[PDB]
Enzyme design. Structure first.
Site, PDB file in Angstrom:
ATOM      1  N   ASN A 218      -8.088   7.914  -5.696  1.00 27.92           N
ATOM      2  CA  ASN A 218      -8.715   6.995  -6.436  1.00 27.92           C
ATOM      3  C   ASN A 218      -9.537   7.532  -7.584  1.00 27.92           C
ATOM      4  OD1 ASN A 218      -9.498   5.993  -3.172  1.00 27.92           O
ATOM      5  ND2 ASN A 218      -8.157   5.110  -4.350  1.00 27.92           N
TER       6      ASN A 218
ATOM      7  N   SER B  32     -12.014  10.186  -4.434  1.00 28.84           N
ATOM      8  CA  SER B  32     -11.466   9.865  -3.033  1.00 28.84           C
ATOM      9  C   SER B  32     -10.018   9.758  -2.939  1.00 28.84           C
ATOM     10  CB  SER B  32     -12.181   8.910  -2.407  1.00 28.84           C
ATOM     11  OG  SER B  32     -12.144   7.721  -2.918  1.00 28.84           O
TER      12      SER B  32
ATOM     13  N   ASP C 125     -12.825   7.572  -8.484  1.00 28.46           N
ATOM     14  CA  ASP C 125     -13.939   8.446  -7.835  1.00 28.46           C
ATOM     15  C   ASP C 125     -13.965   9.587  -7.022  1.00 28.46           C
ATOM     16  OD1 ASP C 125     -13.231   7.677  -5.314  1.00 28.46           O
ATOM     17  OD2 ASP C 125     -14.907   6.611  -4.786  1.00 28.46           O
TER      18      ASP C 125
ATOM     19  N   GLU D 149       0.643  -1.327   0.050  1.00 26.95           N
ATOM     20  CA  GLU D 149      -0.062   0.074  -0.106  1.00 26.95           C
ATOM     21  C   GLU D 149       1.061   1.311   0.095  1.00 26.95           C
ATOM     22  OE1 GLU D 149      -2.947   0.364  -0.554  1.00 26.95           O
ATOM     23  OE2 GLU D 149      -4.149  -1.564   0.187  1.00 26.95           O
TER      24      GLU D 149
END
Ligand SMILES: [Cl-]
Ligand SMILES: [Cl-]
Ligand SMILES: [Cl-]
Ligand SMILES: [Cl-]
Ligand code: NA
Ligand code: NA
Length: 129
Positions: A46, A50, A48, A35
């Protein structure tokens, strides 16, 4: 802060992640590696709109407030910037809420795709814990 592998494992154990909900410590170290490469400052957008924050890339759609994710929630009740601190307490405590949300560590797609089904104990080999 960029953690060493065993330094992060020790910090995660001190905060109670070792076998939390059944997930042995190596799972959490493996997830953090893919990560964030063990960097508390990591951020990533991201599709979308976010953003994902910190060593476990916790997203602002559900879990933290960054002031710029319309129609999102803040279920860990924290500003997203707190997840970038050298002190991983907020990231760990929020991760405990996420992993308890029904889907376990499948909530982290990097864990599902890179750690699940592998010898995750390798990630803590050699560490004094
Ligand atoms: Cl490493
Ligand atoms: Cl396990
Ligand atoms: Cl810490
Ligand atoms: Cl589970
Ligand atoms: Na392990
Ligand atoms: Na949010």
């Amino acid at each position: 802060k960029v953690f060493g592998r065993c330094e992060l494992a020790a910090a995660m154990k001190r905060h109670g992640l070792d076998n939390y909900r059944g997930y042995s410590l190596g799972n959490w170290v493996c997830a953090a590696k893919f990560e964030s490469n063990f960097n508390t400052q990591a951020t990533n957008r991201n599709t979308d709109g976010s953003t994902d924050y910190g060593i476990l890339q916790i997203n602002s759609r559900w879990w933290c407030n960054d002031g710029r994710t319309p129609g999102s929630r803040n279920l860990c009740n924290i500003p997203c910037s707190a997840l970038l601190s050298s002190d991983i307490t907020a990231s760990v405590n929020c991760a405990k809420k996420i992993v308890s949300d029904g889907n376990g560590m499948n909530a982290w797609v990097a864990w599902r795709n890179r750690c699940k089904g592998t010898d995750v104990q390798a990630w803590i080999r050699g560490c004094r814990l």
